[PDB]
Amino acid sequence: MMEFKTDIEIAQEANPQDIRDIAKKINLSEDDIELYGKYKAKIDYNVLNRTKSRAGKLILTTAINPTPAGEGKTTTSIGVADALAKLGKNVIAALREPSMGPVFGIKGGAAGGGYAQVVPMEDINLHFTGDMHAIGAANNLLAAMLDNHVYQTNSLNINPKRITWRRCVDMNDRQLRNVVDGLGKKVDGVTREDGFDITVASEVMAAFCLSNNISELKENLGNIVVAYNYSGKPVTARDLNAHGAMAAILKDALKPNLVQTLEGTPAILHGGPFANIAHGCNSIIATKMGMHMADYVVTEAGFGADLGAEKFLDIKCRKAGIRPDAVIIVATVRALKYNGGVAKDQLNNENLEALEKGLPNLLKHIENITQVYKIPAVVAINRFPLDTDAELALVRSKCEELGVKVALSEVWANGGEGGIEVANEVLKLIEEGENNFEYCYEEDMTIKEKLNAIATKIYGADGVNYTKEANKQIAELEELGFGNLPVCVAKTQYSLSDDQTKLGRPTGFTIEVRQANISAGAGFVVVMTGEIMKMPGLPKLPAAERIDVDENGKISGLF
Amino acid sequence: EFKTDIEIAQEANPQDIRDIAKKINLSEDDIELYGKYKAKIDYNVLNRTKSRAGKLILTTAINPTPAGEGKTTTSIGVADALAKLGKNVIAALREPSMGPVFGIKGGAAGGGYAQVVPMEDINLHFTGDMHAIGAANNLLAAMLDNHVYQTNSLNINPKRITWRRCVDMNDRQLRNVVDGLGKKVDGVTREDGFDITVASEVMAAFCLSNNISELKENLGNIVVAYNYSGKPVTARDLNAHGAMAAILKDALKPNLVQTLEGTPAILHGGPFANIAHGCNSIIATKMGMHMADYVVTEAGFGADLGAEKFLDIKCRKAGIRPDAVIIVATVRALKYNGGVAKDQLNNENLEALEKGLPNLLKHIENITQVYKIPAVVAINRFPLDTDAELALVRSKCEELGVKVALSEVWANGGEGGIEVANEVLKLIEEGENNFEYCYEEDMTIKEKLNAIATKIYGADGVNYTKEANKQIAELEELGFGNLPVCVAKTQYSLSDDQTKLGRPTGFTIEVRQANISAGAGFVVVMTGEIMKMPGLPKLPAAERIDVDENGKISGLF
Ligand SMILES: COc1ccc2cc3[n+](cc2c1OC)CCc1cc2c(cc1-3)OCO2
Ligand SMILES: COc1ccc2cc3[n+](cc2c1OC)CCc1cc2c(cc1-3)OCO2
Ligand SMILES: COc1ccc2cc3[n+](cc2c1OC)CCc1cc2c(cc1-3)OCO2
Ligand SMILES: COc1ccc2cc3[n+](cc2c1OC)CCc1cc2c(cc1-3)OCO2
Ligand code: PRO
Ligand code: PRO
Ligand code: PRO
Ligand code: PRO
Ligand code: PRO
Ligand code: PRO
Ligand code: PRO
Ligand code: PRO
Ligand code: PRO
């Protein structure tokens, strides 16, 4: 027979505390909190200026390259945080907010999974506290003011063909990828090519997550480059007098959102940019908030260590002035056997030979964390019942040779109890740890030197090649004065290389850069190794067709 | 003696919204808080409480003039006045669109000392209803295009797609677009456009639904296109309405807010008054009548548009009947109808006041003699209004059997509305159930149009273009001839000619176009061009908007 519980059944049967009690666990009075129902809350960012910082530790959760087998990065983050709570520690989980668009294409999902989730699950997947709407409104206001300026006088001499700013919407709408607007009468605007991204891909989202306060948000938004003039110089949102209004739309959204786990552990969800064209981390203001209110903060970055962790350490940690005390590298035996050449169908059979072929992927990410950034790390293996004792022993052997212990995580089935082993090793790394954190590169280096450093040190590439047009675009960015910013490499996440088919630990390859541009608002240069989907489409049978509401207003079909 | 509306709003002491909910017998478990000054009310509270069967007070006005009339200020003021008189009362109002705030600055819900607070939050995101309306609108658009891109098994003709996308911005750039460009995987190339979010039919259907079940059903009946066989394709055909109602599940809960004097207020919905009915949502008015003894609501654009549609559309679908009608006007506005220039409105001009008074008199006749509802004229008094001017207006209105009450709510708060509120209470106790619609649902579209044009506007009849006739003919064949008609004409005149002030007589209505809003449940009829997406000014008000280091917004008002 069978008997099992889906994540939504686990979320339904939960007993979530009043968010006011959750706030009490981190010394947040009722007068420091804006309630959104009794299970969601927004935290005033002005509590930092009137309370004493606990100077909590920072625990960064990452993973190997994503595989169709799944690794359970966010489930481990929530589970380890719950474990530290079982150990009597004052801990906060810092996570991102999901986009709403994909819920209607491919269905929504739990914050984590199993018994390591964040609740309320339904609200988190939909409107939550409205941050996504605030991001999009600010994005589209700047777009309307840009087009309005060109329509009224165009005194800034904006070249319509060099307009880089794009509108956005929080839906999976392929139809809006490439558009032409401004058609009609003379009074209907100026005809030009345009496009829509999904809201989370907007640069507003990136700068939103890299602002320390509302004044830095207003300053970052003004630095956004929306076009170039006929002289080749950048035209910014500040030049349009737009950043003040955009900061007014985001005034409430910039407050971090307080929720909880299934075990009552305080959780903060805030922001959620891409992990290829952005850094893929939750907001700085939320991570700073947590370290100010708790002794431990468990956060995470998307797409695995070669992308999210690299940008957490080289972009976020630089702009926030923070240092991880420990790093959790998540992996599963099935994912490693997948790197070894096993097809997705056969990942449940024992295959020591394939596990050994795919282990160099985990080994490379360990070397990057512990030998390039010099940060104490622990491997968290999300154990499955078919994981043989030899498979676990082989993984532990090769990881011990690099000085890293392997802790078995069972938070998906046992909640915080299943994360005590990982939590204990993390506390051990924090106490026995020293400040050896090193960036992958220095800011004074050129854009090509920074890319060369990341490709060689992190990806394992022999070097970086540039197309004819990429070299031109990088040369312009150096001339305009952007060569002193961090670089954000937008490449595939399924491989250490830029070739999504090269599993394991590819060697003797080169990265092919074909496009580059400036995200002056977020504060980094974006570099492309291929086409990047900034607006997903809907499948043939969208998930929306099964979503329903009953006479009492209960939603079904979401998960 | 006092300051601007934003300064009055800042110097106000709003109570905790939980205490405001206590005034209308709402427990803490009936209330979702959005800070301690806003709250959403569960619409299931109706299913566990006994209805107080409260009275319905409709607030309308004369045709909007550049002089202003202060309609919403009077509604809030009369609501505060009934509170001063120890009555249990709720003010039901509309939510403002956030878009125009960044063009022509924001404004108060009301004005003077008759406001609704928080003013700042109401002008922006409020509780997110506008975002949900747009999300539901844009999901249906994405699923419509996806179906055509995938299989188009419904044989949708892209040249017959009527659904439009939306955004809550004043963006003239998105009026006419071509989307679907790019690779073969980037969609189907076609012409398209955007409207401001509050102009979506999702907004009108949102406001004409009695419960979450009718919302899902109404959303399903929305016509999004036509197949090559000429038959309507709906959102139900796309299996979208269940998902759209899920996006709106929390939005459909009315928003509990308060006035300056602590009176409970509900702001929910905000459709256009020309291409829609311009009323707050039916659930908000039902909720108020369920939880209180008196409800003051309003309709936009004066009696010939909002009040007409409030009575012939909203009242029909909700099954409610107004117990009294407040017709708001000013001496300045009537003298404007009499031929006085905008700059000369401060001098006494009894001759021009008599030339413009027929406008107010026609609206009285429609309320009291066509719909048969008791009415009272509320004059928002100005300091330079001579006693003779006020006496002339009182004279002509009493010839029709309607008292004139002087309103000073703007400068005096609820005290300034006691005179109006008293006549409203007198009209409710002495009134009878004589309410009649202007037309019956059985009549054809052109008969329903001829009924409104002649009885309400004062026209000799209705003329139709060739294209208007074909569209009306096609709407009859498809089976939409049984719905009400929502006439979209100018608000500055009883006629379809914005220059004909006062009380025009020898005119006829020209219909250029007819469309179907099957989700809202009415047929829209055009007399001219309708701007569903306004543009930003040369100097947008958003350039003056700023935020300080503590997160305080300036320049909004
Ligand atoms: C989202 O992440 C997930 C999602 C799903 C997961 C499912 C399972 N596990 C981790 C998961 C995980 O973490 C890696 C490991 C324990 C387990 C035992 C089982 C089983 C499934 C799983 O089927 C029968 O016995
Ligand atoms: C306890 O065992 C340990 C402890 C510490 C170890 C440290 C390192 N390694 C193994 C270790 C090990 O396993 C043998 C492998 C090579 C290496 C290169 C590096 C580095 C550290 C290490 O920093 C920068 O470059
Ligand atoms: C794969 O199946 C598909 C996929 C997409 C299809 C798209 C269209 N049609 C069949 C399709 C079909 O069936 C053969 C025929 C009706 C039509 C009219 C149009 C149009 C595209 C289509 O663009 C403008 O006017
Ligand atoms: C029943 O009659 C029909 C039925 C189906 C018809 C389908 C199409 N057209 C007329 C039709 C018609 O004419 C009256 C012409 C426009 C068109 C563009 C297209 C397409 C199909 C069609 O596929 C892709 O681009
Ligand atoms: O644009 C300005 O004048 C300043 C610079 C940072 C925030 N606003
Ligand atoms: O000790 C650390 O590494 C972090 C840095 C910011 C405060 N605590
Ligand atoms: O490596 C660097 O340049 C800085 C020093 C503190 C941490 N990272
Ligand atoms: O179908 C689309 O429009 C995109 C591109 C391929 C996968 N999803
Ligand atoms: O109505 C309000 O909310 C304004 C703005 C803050 C103080 N008073
Ligand atoms: O079937 C079609 O026509 C579109 C294009 C690829 C899959 N869906
Ligand atoms: O979707 C694609 O990739 C093909 C190639 C160009 C036209 N469409
Ligand atoms: O209209 C409705 O509500 C249902 C949904 C599927 C078809 N009929
Ligand atoms: O499109 C509009 O609404 C304004 C009016 C003239 C200039 N643009």
Residue numbers in the entry:
A (entry chain B): 0 to 558
B (entry chain A): 2 to 558
Extract from the study:
FtfL is a key enzyme in C1 metabolism pathway. It catalyzes the synthesis of formyltetrahydrofolic acid from formic acid and tetrahydrofolic acid. PaFtfL exhibits a tetramer in all three crystal structures, consistent with other reported FtfL crystal structures.
In the crystal structure of PaFtfL-BBR, the Fo-Fc electron density difference map clearly shows three types of binding sites of BBR. In the first type of binding site, named as “active site,” two molecules of BBR occupy the active site of protomers B and D, respectively, in which BBR mainly makes Van der Waals interactions with surrounding residues (T74, N381, F383, P384, W411). Specifically, the B ring of BBR is sandwiched between the aromatic side chains of residues F383 and W411. Structural comparison among our crystal structures of PaFtfL-BBR, PaFtfL-ATP, and MtFtfL-folate suggests that BBR overlaps with ATP and tetrahydrofolate on binding to FtfL, indicating that BBR likely competes with ATP and tetrahydrofolate to bind FtfL active site. We infer that the binding of BBR at the subunit interface might contribute to its inhibition on PaFtfL catalytic reaction through allosteric effect, and simultaneous binding at both allosteric and active sites explains the potent inhibition of BBR on PaFtfL.
